[PDB]
């Protein structure tokens, strides 16, 4: 009965930056791996970035270099830095965690990037 | 794949 709480999303201008937050909840047990997937409208869901408890991290090719995942100081909490956002980054972003051998998924938070900029 | 990283042991 682990609960994911995703925050930081919303409706943003092209070229701006955004940080998502995800806190896995209801466990005293550190995760093994935690990260983000995303679903562009009408497209399949795809992994974005993941980080293991050791700090070892993995990025999908479509975002590698543009996004950065990290461990917050808080128990079972990770951040996704999304820099230089573009309309193709528009998507539902889903947090996922693996704790004690079980995967848990968040409800997802929208990140929408208009083509208009500052 | 992304899923190979996800499932892998640390």
Author numbering:
A (entry chain A): 1 to 118
B (entry chain B): 1 to 10
Give the original sentences from the paper that presented this experimental model:
Models of antibody (Ab)–antigen complexes can be used to understand interaction mechanisms and for improving affinity. This study evaluates the use of the protein structure prediction algorithm AlphaFold (AF) for exploration of interactions between peptide epitope tags and the smallest functional Ab fragments, nanobodies (Nbs). Nbs represent the smallest Ab fragment that maintains high antigen-binding affinity. Features of Nbs potentially useful for modeling applications are their small size, rigid single-domain architecture, and binding mechanism that relies on only three CDRs (versus six for conventional IgGs). In this study, we evaluated the performance of AF for predicting the structures of Nbs bound to experimentally validated, linear, short peptide epitopes (Nb–tag pairs).
Prior to this work, no experimental structural data were available for the Nb127–127-tag complex, even though it has been used as an epitope tag. We experimentally confirmed high affinity binding (KD – 14 nM) between Nb127 and the 127-tag peptide using surface plasmon resonance (SPR) assays. To provide further context for evaluating the performance of AF2, we crystallized the Nb127–127-tag complex and using X-ray crystallography solved a 2.1 Å structure. The asymmetric unit contains a single Nb127–127-tag complex in a 1:1 binding mode. The model was clearly defined from Glu1 to Ser115 in Nb127, with the 127-tag peptide showing a clear fit within the electron density map. Nb127 interacts with the 127-tag via five antiparallel beta sheets (β4, β5, β6, β9, and β10). This interaction is stabilized by eight strong hydrogen bonds involving residues Glu3′, Phe5′, Trp6′, Lys7′, and Asp10′ of the 127-tag and Tyr37, Lys96, Lys32, Ser54, and Arg52 of Nb127. Water-mediated hydrogen bonds also contribute to the interaction, particularly through a network of four water molecules bridging Gly57 of Nb127 with Ser1′ and Phe2′ of the 127-tag. The Nb127–127-tag complex is further stabilized by pi–cation interactions between Lys96, Lys32, and Trp6′, as well as pi–pi interactions involving Trp105, Phe2′, and Tyr37, which were observed to reinforce the peptide structure and enhance the engagement between Nb127- and 127-tag complex tag. Overlay and alignment of the experimental structure with the set of AF2 models also reveals a high degree of similarity.
